[PDB]
Symmetry: D2
């Protein structure tokens, strides 16, 4: 199953090791990443929305790795598998 | 007194660089609307930040970002209120 | 209660009194809009992700109105009320 | 040369639908677009493009020269 997905999550930017982790993972799987929207919602917290593209198993595995990191809050995935 | 588009390229593994870029933007989160990030290759990221506020304050904030060691291709488009 | 939300949906850009309606209603409510990301996922379909901010009841009501337009598909609202 | 590019512009939406359709004609050129509804009438959009710099100046023509598009700017980032 190919498709798209929308992955969103909140984190504190001052948690530097977490943040570096999040961007680096996206670069490692940069093939799966289309682009990410970031809102610095307040002094401490960031809301990010990553648009992903690829095989749905791969997209979900990737999303899991992100959402299952201590410090990531409100992790959410919307899967958009290819339509006929 | 307006909007602005701030764009730049940087290496995300440069830990201090990356830290300062996001930290400066959170210090002025009131001047920030939203940022689009594109991972252009394994090392480099492209960000485009839309800014809003007093043009003096927005320029000074954009300068603070652009002036950081390792920020490349920095560009500011000012859009003062019409 | 106040907060943020992520409203996403898919639409055909050619069926576009629809696209005009979708941008126009966001402008009528631009106080709720932060910014919107668009990805042209294929030649016919557009994925939009609208970040919203405000009262969560107004955000819900706004989002329901967007999603109820015929031709908006995959309408999805993720609410992030203030913690 | 290949690379990326940033195309920004302002327009009155009440146009939005043809600019979108115009980018779909080139959707292989498009990465994603950020849009901010800056006031009741006007939209700010920033399109990130990727591909051949000549297709990119091409894309950026079918938008920037259109009537009603203001504040257009193209930044090309040829691969380093
Ligand atoms: Ni942030
Ligand atoms: Ni990146
Ligand atoms: Ni589109
Ligand atoms: Ni708009």
């Amino acid at each position: 199953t190919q498709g798209f997905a929308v992955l969103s999550y909140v984190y504190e930017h001052e948690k530097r090791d977490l943040a570096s982790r999040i961007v680096s993972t996206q670069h490692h799987h940069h093939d799966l990443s289309v682009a990410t929207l970031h809102v610095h919602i307040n002094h401490d917290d960031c809301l990010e929305i990553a648009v992903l593209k690829g095989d749905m198993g791969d997209v979900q595995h990737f999303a899991d790795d992100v959402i299952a990191q201590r410090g990531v809050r409100h992790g959410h995935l919307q899967c958009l598998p290819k339509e006929d």
